[PDB]
Amino acid sequence: XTXPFXX
Amino acid sequence: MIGLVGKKVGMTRIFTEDGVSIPVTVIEVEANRVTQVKDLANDGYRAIQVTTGAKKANRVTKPEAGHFAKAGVEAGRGLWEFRLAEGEEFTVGQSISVELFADVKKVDVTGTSKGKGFAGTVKRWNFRTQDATHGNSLSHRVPGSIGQNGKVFKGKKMAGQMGNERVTVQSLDVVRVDAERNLLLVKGAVPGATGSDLIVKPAVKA
RNA sequence: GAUGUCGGCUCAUCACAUCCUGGGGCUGAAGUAGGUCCCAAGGGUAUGGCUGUUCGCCAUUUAAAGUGGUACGCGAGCUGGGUUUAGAACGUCGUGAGACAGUUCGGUCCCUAUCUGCCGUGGGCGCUGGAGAACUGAGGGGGGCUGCUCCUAGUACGAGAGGACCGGAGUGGACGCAUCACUGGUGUUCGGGUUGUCAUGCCAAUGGCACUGCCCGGUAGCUAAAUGCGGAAGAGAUAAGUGCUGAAAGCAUCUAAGCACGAAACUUGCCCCGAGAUGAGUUCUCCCUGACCCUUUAAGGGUCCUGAAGGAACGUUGAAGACGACGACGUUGAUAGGCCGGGUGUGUAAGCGCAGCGAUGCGUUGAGCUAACCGGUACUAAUGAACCGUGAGGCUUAACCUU
RNA sequence: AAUUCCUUGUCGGGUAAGUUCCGACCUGCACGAAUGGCGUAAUGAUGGCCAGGCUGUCUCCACCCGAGACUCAGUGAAAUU
RNA sequence: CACAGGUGGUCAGGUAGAGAAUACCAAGGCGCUUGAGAGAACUCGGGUGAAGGAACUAGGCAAAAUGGUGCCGUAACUUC
RNA sequence: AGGACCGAACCGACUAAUGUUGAAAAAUUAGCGGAUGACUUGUGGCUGGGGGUGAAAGGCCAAUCAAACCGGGAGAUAGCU
Ligand SMILES: C=CC[C@@H]1/C=C/C(=O)NC/C=C/C(C)=C/[C@@H](O)C[C@@H](F)Cc2nc(co2)C(=O)N2CCC[C@@H]2C(=O)O[C@@H]1C(C)C
């Protein structure tokens, strides 16, 4: 959700 | 023509009269002896079989005992072969000295390299190390990519055993030949560590 | 009911529409230096400044700083500046919530590798008696770059200025292998200085702890920035291209038959692996020359005796090593450790004595200590043994024995 | 310009070379005066830039001391299929 | 969970030090419920480094060192 | 004297690395910031779900917040898998 998995 | 078998005794410095220091790799070329003389009627190539050194009586095998006793030559520490250039002739029991290299002026030495064991790509293939800081995550001295978007091509430079293999240095200048001491002063460095056996043959590259 | 996106880093790989080097044709090619086109992919093919950038501009180099494919190669390899969340501002639009391919500051990138594949390294079996070595080399990799300077020659050319191919020599850069004698780094296993502190009863003298307490040096070994070598020459067949002879086609023509030149490509030669090359190779040497039974009577099975050549295991070990493996030795013995001597390094120990008010200094003394190194030494330990594998090696054919 | 599309505006300074930075000009795509304007000493784990010093960040990595990785005995795990 | 976790109060030795910092100790309490051997790549945590010294990179992350006491001395600007 | 200075406890959490089936469902190590104050802390108590509280982030309200948890309406409805 935050950008690339899982930022 | 043919070469010989000796021992790497080490390295020292030779000072000339003009004040120059010539690196040398001293070699203890003990008196060699021929063991077999092979021709085309039986084997199919003109070569010889030479040994050197000595060995313990109660340690050498019986098969080789007859192989050496056949030629009436005391046992050695091994066996090697040299091909003849269509103009060489020898006989079993013949002893060969270091004077054979009296008028050659150059040789190509051969021997086994030192043992580095399991080595990395940097130690082995001179790979470029990645960034040590500025984000690097457990990938400092690693190779990196090894392919594309689906098999690693054969011969891919990787980590593995480094050393302990046949190595041949070429066109080494000769400096001195002292038959009294059975020595040979070869310029430069050669493979193998002190005590290891190595081959010395005239230079084909001039 | 998930194929993770620019660029950088790293590691690369193929194509040739060739950037350089190589070989040629025409040239409005004098020469030097260029232009154009052909053959050629063997190897090689910048560093930095600004920018997140690729790109691009700029500076300075280079023989040249190639064009492209590989999920605009490569995030179960790294990065996370950019893109691409939630936060907050400017500009702008909207009454407003909010929004913009407008900008700006900030902002968790997970995975112990089952298979394939790749780099390395072993076991087992096989190759037809078995065992121990040395080879053949079918095949497969590695390597293949290049500048400058001098002579040839201030020659040919040219009015001068300017300034050669051909051929030879030397010296360099980058890359690559090996090596540690030299120059050096490392050296928490050597020595010494020294702060604070605890302890060894105390002084003296030592040791521990504090990043090896902080430092100065430094053996072996490893190692590069250090020093030696290397790219080839040569040969054969060729590409573009140039040809001789020569008809078809009375002449002409490099070709159709024939024949001679021809490049860093290809095949060779240099280096390494290499008989699991199941097409399983070749040479030398060594060891085994039993008594019977029974049986679907056979490449049959079992018992008693026999147990070699050699190997393995075990052990002491290695400039060999992840483990296996490989190498050396095992009392007929220097394999390791210790011990003796020596060398190297550290730098005048301790103790006593002398001087001085004392801290300290001097003499004994270049003293004592000293790791892995050199040369020697059986003092200890590597044990007699047993464990291991056998007994003449099939059938057929041809030639020999008994040419 | 935390605002400027054209744009790395133009000039100058600094650098061997500066799309960034500072100082000026104004052609203000689309600043603007309490949703405040222009300044402002000091302050800031604030943003941007240039220096000195310092260094293995790098050129180009090398060696060493430790904990794992590796082997042996013991226990024995987890994810996908 | 036999957990690198959190926390309210009280007692507060000696040497050095300004100090409840820090370093070595006392009292007293522990060595952290698997170990042995080897001494490869690579990773983690550290130490040293030839010559150059930010050329690294989006951007100088860490390290080291400046680091303490006393004395001299101390710019622009300023709300003094 | 000081919402003053350096700096432990204490309270915080700017950077980096490790870890990321972790020792740990947000930590460790190295440094870092405030440290007489708008400070911090113990015990107890009160404000309560379209409401509370909020030096304001759509933050917190028992590891859950653009409307908590539990139960019930309830076998909500699902023209979609
Ligand atoms: C605020 C968050 C940005 C947001 C992300 C949405 C999102 O749901 N991302 C999850 C990623 C899913 C992936 C990687 C799935 C793969 O199985 C297939 C893809 F690979 C195919 C593919 N993706 C893209 C292009 O092609 C692609 O555009 N994206 C993949 C990475 C994120 C980016 C994207 O969607 O960004 C959006 C922007 C635009 C608003």
Curated annotation (Swiss-Prot), chain B:
Entries under InterPro entries matching the protein: Ribosomal_uL3, Ribosomal_uL3_bac/org-type, Ribosomal_uL3_CS, Transl_B-barrel_sf
Recorded superkingdom: Bacteria
Alphabetically ordered keywords of this record: Methylation, Ribonucleoprotein, Ribosomal protein, RNA-binding, rRNA-binding
GO function term, MF aspect, one: structural constituent of ribosome
Gene3D superfamilies given in the database record: 3.30.160.810, Translation factors
Modification(s) after translation: Methylated by PrmB.
Modified residues (N6-succinyllysine): 38
GO BP: any one term: cytoplasmic translation
Cellular component GO terms, alphabetical: cytoplasm; cytosol; cytosolic large ribosomal subunit
Pfam families, per database record: Ribosomal_L3
Stated role: One of two assembly initiator proteins, it binds directly near the 3'-end of the 23S rRNA, where it nucleates assembly of the 50S subunit.
Protein family: Belongs to the universal ribosomal protein uL3 family.
Oligomeric and partner information: Part of the 50S ribosomal subunit. Forms a cluster with proteins L14 and L19. In pull-down experiments interacts with CedA.
NCBIfam families per record: L3_bact (TIGR03625)
This protein's name: Large ribosomal subunit protein uL3
Annotated source species: Escherichia coli (strain K12)
Source taxonomy: Bacteria, Pseudomonadati, Pseudomonadota, Gammaproteobacteria, Enterobacterales
